[PDB]
Amino acid sequence: GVYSSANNCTFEYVSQPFLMFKNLREFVFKNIDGYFKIYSKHTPIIGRDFPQGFSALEPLVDLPIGINITRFQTLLA
Amino acid sequence: VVVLSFELLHAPATVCGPKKSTNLVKNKCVNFNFNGLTGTGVLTKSNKKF
């Protein structure tokens, strides 16, 4: 949680869902006509990875940012 | 002196004037506009679960 440096911040968004024996955490990230959309769902895990049965992801956020995305990196602890 | 640029840009953006809302009326034939969805009809309480 150290972070480093950024400038000229354009958009902010906080705690729409506040947080987002185990749970599968599925996300879909898409960028259409300047709107960045995130869809996600949590599925309980009982020790079987990827519990079976159909499960659809509900929309999480819709950000009217206009950012051009060509690459992304996952940030791990 | 205050000068307002109102520059506008290609990217989608939501700065907008406030939209006033009237009072709701049910069981009568009315025109309606619900968050940009427009039409004419009779509004009644629904049993549908969204």
How deeply is A33 buried, as exposed, middle or buried, from its count of CB atoms within 10 A (0-12, 13-18, 19+)? exposed
CB A60 within 8 A of CB A39: yes
Pairing of strands A58-64, A22-32: unpaired
Least CA distance to A66: which residue of chain B? B11
Contact A66 B13 (CB under 8 A): yes
* Cα–Cα distance measured from residue A15 to residue A52, given in angstroms and rounded to the nearest whole number: 30
Cα A60 from Cα A40, distance rounded (Å): 6
Which residues of B touch chain A, with CB atoms under 8 Å apart? 9-14
From residue A32, give the alpha-carbon distance in Å to each of A9, A26, B34, B42: 21, 20, 24, 35
CB contact set of B24 (below 8 Å; sequence gap of 6+): B43
Task: From B15, B18, A9, A63, select the one nearest B6 (Cα to Cα).
Answer: B15
- Nearest CA-CA partner of A57 in A41, A36, A37, A42: A41
Contact residues, chain A, for B12 at CB < 8 Å: 33-35, 64, 66
Which amino acid type is present at position B41? Answer: G
Question: CA A65 from chain center: how many Å?
Answer: 15
